[PDB]
Each structure stands twice: as structure tokens, then as C-alpha cells.
């Protein structure tokens, strides 16, 4: 069979490194956020069918601005994205996971609400999780707790829980070589090395500080290509993105690349 989740034309290096995919996007603020503080929903106006939904959580003391470049980037390729603010900026990773799932729950209900810009735009069975630092650990925790999640792509993850051996959710860990907040060999390395049952990839930005994948970063061409490709391959089962998702980028801006069980 045709894969009914395929959206957009065949990807290219340049179409993926571009700021924007083939779809127009708009956004709205969530009026009455349920179980988190605030949310901006990015969506394609014209994806040619329902698309999956991704919730993205900031790090400790941070807000939507740290992680919201992902909103337009992913929405323009055919995803509905919610970037959230947490109940408290001091929330820890387990709390962030709960709020991440709550945000996905509300994206889903809004997609079933006739009032909403995203009415009928979402396949609420196809969800992804992303986030920075403690929001990244929350994404791992979400994936651990809920194996039906299709994909995880946290960045510079921080988590006091170290054991993700149970993960079957395809996970791309974005890491920052010189991270002094969520040091790679105490966080990202440990998380990755615990995994064995899931498609997975480790993409570490050369000399990256803790904020190496945040809004305004100097590696959007590479990071955006990889994040979109991962979400396409695993959220849409879209085999046109296997090579993009699974390949070594062979970039000098990558200090360490690892991959396993990726086709």
C-alpha cells in the first residue's frame, strides 16, 4: 500500500536545510491552557491531510522563546506544534512530562473543537515530544511512560532518571559538546547508552554550549534537517526520510555522531 501519512514532495538536502518546508503555517495562543501555563500552537494551513502533533517544553527557568524556532520549522513540513510555558519555570522533568502530555491532550481536544484553527487537522494517535534540558528529560520520561508516542527528539537533556532501557520510542538525542549544565557524559551519553530496543541517534554539536539547539542558534540548517527528518520518518512512517534521519551528516559542526537500529 501507499503510506497514507505521507505529506509533501520528496525531500532534498536543500528542502530540509531551508528555513521553511512546503507548507504555509499560522499560529495561535491557547485561550484556556489546561494543565500547563501557556501555549502557542503552530500549524500548516494546507498540509493535504491530518498531521501528527508535537509538544515542546523549555528548560529550567526558561520559556517558549528558548525552543520556539522549532514551531515554524516543523509546522511548515506538516506537523501541528505546541510550544508551552510550564506551570512554574522551576518545574522538574517529571512535572514537565505531565505538562507535555497535557499539552498534547489539549491539542487533541482542540483538533476536535469546531471553533479551532486546527479543527480536523490532527491525527491524535501520532504524537512527538521535544524539549530543552529539563524539558528534554521530560520528553524522555514521556516516551518511557507512554510507548505509543511515535518519536522523541530532546535537546541537551537533563534528567535525574538515567535509565531509559525500556524505550521503544524512536529517539534522536541532540547534544551540546561543551554543555556545563546538562554535561553530556552525565546526561545525554548516559541516556543514549541505556537504550537498546529503539531506533535511536545521537547528534552532538561541536563546541556547543548548553543552548546550542535553542532559538537563534547557528546550526538551524543541520538541526532543522535532522529534527524534521526524524519526525517525518517516525511520526509519519515516511520512508522517504530514512536516509536523512539515519545518515551520518559528516559535518565538522558535529563532534560526535552515533546511530543504531535506524532502518
Author numbering: 42 to 304
Provide excerpts from the study.
The second enzyme, AdCut, is found in the bacteria Acidovorax delafieldii, which is able to grow on poly(butylene succinate) (PBS) as its sole carbon and energy source. IsPETase and AdCut are highly homologous (82% sequence identity and 89% sequence similarity). Given the sequence identity and the presence of the same catalytic triad, AdCut most likely uses the same reaction mechanism. Despite the enzymes showing a very high sequence identity of 82%, IsPETase shows significant hydrolysis activity for both polymers, whereas AdCut only shows significant hydrolysis activity for PBS.
AdCut was expressed and purified, and the structure was solved to a 1.5 Å resolution. Solving the structure of AdCut enabled the verification of the positioning of the functionally active catalytic triad, as well as providing an experimental structure for modeling substrate interactions. As expected from the high degree of sequence identity with IsPETase, the RMSD value between both structures is low, 0.41 Å (262 aligned residues). Consequently, the canonical catalytic triad of AdCut (residues S174, D220, and H251) aligns very well with that of IsPETase (residues S160, D206, and H237), with the residues surrounding the catalytic pocket very similar for both enzymes. However, despite these similarities, it is interesting to note subtle differences in the shapes of the two binding pockets. The cavity in IsPETase is broader, slightly longer, and, toward the right-hand side, is shallower when compared with the cavity in AdCut. For PET, product formation (TPA, MHET, and BHET) shows that only IsPETase is able to catalyze this reaction, while AdCut did not cause any significant PET degradation above the negative control. The rate of production of succinic acid was slower and plateaued at a lower level compared to PBS and AdCut alone. This suggests that PET is binding to AdCut active sites and competitively inhibits the turnover of PBS. The restricted space surrounding the catalytic Ser174 residue in AdCut appears to be playing a key role in hindering the reaction. For AdCut with PET, the nucleophilic attack is sterically hindered with the Oγ–CC=O unable to adopt the necessary distance expected for the reaction.
